[PDB]
């Protein structure tokens, strides 16, 4: 049972550090999307999600 508990601790740290670096990567992506050429990348993505809106719409 203690071995099972140790592997539970192992999985706990696995998900823990996974979430930690997930938050770090998220912060990097956040600064990036802030830094994006606003109207340009937003217009690319805007027509993109407009087409995706139409894609969900035909659905």
């Amino acid at each position: 049972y203690k071995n099972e508990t140790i592997q539970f601790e192992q999985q706990k740290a696995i998900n823990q550090v996974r979430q930690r670096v997930f938050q770090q990567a998220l912060q990097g992506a956040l600064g990036t999307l802030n830094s994006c050429l606003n109207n340009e990348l937003h217009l690319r993505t805007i027509n993109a999600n407009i087409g995706m809106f139409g894609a969900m719409n035909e659905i």
């Binding site: 203690k2 670096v21 997930f22 990567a25 990036t32």
Partner: protein
Amino acid sequence: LEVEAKLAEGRKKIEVELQEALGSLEQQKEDTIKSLDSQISALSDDIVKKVLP
């Protein structure tokens, strides 16, 4: 009496050895939490890049 003596002793010794195992995995996973901030930065690039569809 003596069998239960050595048996509860076995409970305590397996407890101490498992305690050593748990503290060792604690230091191991703590080191791993310290380890590969390089892989964490690979992920920092990766989820930003895969973030922008």
